[PDB]
């Protein structure tokens, strides 16, 4: 019964058009709940889950100002980093920022994070102690010096251990009906012959939340891994997830195989068989 809040920011420069595109999203666990998009008409932080709509306009007002200021800072940092890397004002670049907190089953702080990237690679990150920073390269070192001399880590830590955790707890309460659920996967198996002496068995899990899941093929009780083809867990579009796993078997050997299915919403692992 661990939970986490995470915010994701992406700023992309748009050389030859105008200001950067800036996109913010917020999650509690695997569930999205707010968004800000610099292009959109509204210019507001916007609800994305039924249970955050009960917040009064003053929440939206504060979220919208804070997110806006983040946006401006990211816009200026794109300029500086372009310099640091001797890049050019004709090229498009990306800053990404990921932060938030974990709480344990009881609501109390376990872990806090914040990390930044440039053009899809690590740039700088807050360490586990929340008091110090790792810089991925020479440019990020310049940043790290500024942040050390500003005592930025101290303000990160105070948010991550304070407000991050408080608002997470609140949201877990206001949204307990969706957020604290465990929808077990609906499962089934399919069978396509593909030669004379060969068929695909595909094992399916649909409708589950949270997204964390394991699917495993066995042959006479022993885990395969060599011929399992398996897709990334993908979202369904209604807050649930899907996933599958396939294995190519000799035709006639179908009952030797079993698919094992692990999920937090399942009292015990499931075993599927083509039967």
């Amino acid at each position: 019964g661990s939970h986490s809040m995470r915010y994701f920011y992406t700023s992309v420069s748009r050389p030859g058009r105008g200001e950067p595109r800036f996109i913010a999203v917020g999650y509690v666990d695997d569930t999205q709940f707010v968004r800000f998009d610099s292009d959109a008409a509204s210019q507001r932080m916007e609800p994305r889950a039924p249970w955050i709509e009960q917040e009064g306009p003053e929440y939206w007002d504060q979220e919208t100002r804070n997110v806006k200021a983040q946006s401006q800072t990211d816009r200026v940092d794109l300029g500086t980093l372009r310099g640091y890397y001797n890049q050019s004002e004709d090229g498009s670049h990306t800053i990404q920022i990921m932060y938030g907190c974990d709480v344990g089953p009881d609501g109390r702080f376990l872990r806090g994070y914040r990390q930044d990237a440039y053009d899809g690679k690590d740039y700088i990150a807050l360490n586990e102690d929340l008091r110090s920073w790792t810089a991925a390269d020479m440019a990020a070192q310049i940043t790290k010096r500024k942040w050390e001399a500003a005592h930025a880590a101290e303000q990160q830590r105070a948010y991550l251990e304070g407000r991050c955790v408080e608002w997470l707890r609140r949201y877990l309460e206001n949204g307990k009906e969706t957020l604290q659920r465990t929808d077990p996967p609906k499962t089934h198996m399919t069978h396509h012959p593909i030669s004379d002496h060969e068929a695909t068995l595909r094992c399916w899990a649909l409708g589950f939340y949270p997204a964390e899941i394991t699917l495993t093929w066995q042959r006479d009780g022993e885990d395969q891994t060599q011929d399992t083809e398996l897709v990334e867990t993908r979202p369904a579009g209604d807050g649930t997830f899907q996933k599958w796993a396939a294995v190519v078997v000799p035709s006639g050997e179908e009952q030797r195989y079993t698919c094992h299915v692990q999920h937090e919403g399942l009292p015990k692992p499931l075993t599927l068989r083509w039967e």
Binding site: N66, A150, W167
Partner: peptide
């Protein structure tokens, strides 16, 4: 809820 030295 989300989160110039002289």
């Amino acid at each position: 809820a989300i989160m110039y030295p002289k």
